[PDB]
Amino acid sequence: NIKTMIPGVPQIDAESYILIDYNSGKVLAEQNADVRRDPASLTKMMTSYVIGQAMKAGKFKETDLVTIGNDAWATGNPVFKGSSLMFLKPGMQVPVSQLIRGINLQSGNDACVAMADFAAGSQDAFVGLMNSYVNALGLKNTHFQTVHGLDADGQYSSARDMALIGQALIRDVPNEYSIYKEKEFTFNGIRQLNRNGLLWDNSLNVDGIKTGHTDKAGYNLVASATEGQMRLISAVMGGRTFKGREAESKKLLTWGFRFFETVNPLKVGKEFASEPVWFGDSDRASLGVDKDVYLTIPRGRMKDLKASYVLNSSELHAPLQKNQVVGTINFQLDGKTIEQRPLVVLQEIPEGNF
Numbered sequence: 001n002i003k004t005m006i007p008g009v010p011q012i013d014a015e016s017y018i019l020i021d022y023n024s025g026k027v028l029a030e031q032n033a034d035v036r037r038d039p040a041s042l043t044k045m046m047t048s049y050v051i052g053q054a055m056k057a058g059k060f061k062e063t064d065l066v067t068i069g070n071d072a073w074a075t076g077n078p079v080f081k082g083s084s085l086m087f088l089k090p091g092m093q094v095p096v097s098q099l100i101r102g103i104n105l106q107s108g109n110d111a112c113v114a115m116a117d118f119a120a121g122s123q124d125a126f127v128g129l130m131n132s133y134v135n136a137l138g139l140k141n142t143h144f145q146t147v148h149g150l151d152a153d154g155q156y157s158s159a160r161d162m163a164l165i166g167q168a169l170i171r172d173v174p175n176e177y178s179i180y181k182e183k184e185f186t187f188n189g190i191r192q193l194n195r196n197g198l199l200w201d202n203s204l205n206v207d208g209i210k211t212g213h214t215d216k217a218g219y220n221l222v223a224s225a226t227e228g229q230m231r232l233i234s235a236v237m238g239g240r241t242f243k244g245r246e247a248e249s250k251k252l253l254t255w256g257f258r259f260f261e262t263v264n265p266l267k268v269g270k271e272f273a274s275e276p277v278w279f280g281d282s283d284r285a286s287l288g289v290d291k292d293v294y295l296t297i298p299r300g301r302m303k304d305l306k307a308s309y310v311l312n313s314s315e316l317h318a319p320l321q322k323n324q325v326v327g328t329i330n331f332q333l334d335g336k337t338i339e340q341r342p343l344v345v346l347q348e349i350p351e352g353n354f
């Protein structure tokens, strides 16, 4: 009973939430995770993702100066009334490094415009890139209309989708993601604090990602934290109170680490199994995976994990291509398969030549 316990999920004072494992993608807990909601500044994770991709591709670098245009003039555009702002003015020449911290640390709406025009020519073209990555990432309940996440009539996302955008930032653009734990930066002689309060919570190792409020969105937070081999991502959307804006997410993350763990039982290129092969230059095929296996299991069950496999075909016949799928690996706990991963050929086996 203690081994097989299913933990009760804490009550979360928000419209929707999800808690996932960064490495395995396992969903640990969820409520209304696919409900479409106003994303507020969570939009800026996608803005940041696009900028990170452009930097990874070498389109510009952190030291490059961006010349601020009229559309990013904080006090020249009443759309910015009451929003988080660097107070950019036209003609300023600001390093990319400073603008991306304005976006990431401070959720500067004006910085978002400045970077969008710099990276993509216009806000509309930048929003096209955002939505292109929505498609690339397979997100089913997200659509952006602007570069900053101010409430927009046809813009939406969901707790699942924002968690997946967080996962994507950490995974695909780690140099961009490393910025999010920085507690402060300085622009125009003024120190600006990272708005993610959880960075200062001694009880967790939180290192991201985005907190944000608008009137329609309520309190929103995508947080990520680590403990040993383990990284969790929480998305909590439509948080109902000011006092719960960090605490509700802290409840989820703390619960996650207490009841679950991440195991990495197999890495790419390492032999999980061997099988005979016919017609080859080798008599045996070395079999494993083409992607590191991460599983999320109840905490302390690692010693109970078992693994076995099945094969698609009776016989293996050369030529066998590298990463050719030949079976399935079943990972098991208490006699029941909990996870499956493709079993693939690790080293090519062409037809024998003698």
Ligand SMILES: *[B]([O])([O])[C]([C])[N]C(=O)[C]([C][C][C][C][N]C(=O)O[C]C1=[C][C]=[C][C]=[C]1)[N]C(=O)[C][C][C]([N]C(=O)OC([C])([C])[C])C([O])=O
Pocket: 040, 041, 042, 078, 079, 080, 081, 082, 083, 084, 085, 086, 107, 109, 148, 149, 150, 151, 211, 212, 213, 214, 215
């Ligand atoms: B994200 O979630 O951080 C981001 C998308 N949210 C914000 O930027 C919100 C602003 C939402 C706009 C609603 N406010 C408003 O006044 O109405 C807009 C309007 C109405 C009519 C016509 C034109 C425009 N902003 C915040 O969450 C922060 C508030 C702001 N913070 C702040 O730090 O202020 C300075 C000036 C220092 C930047 C504040 O308190 O003024």
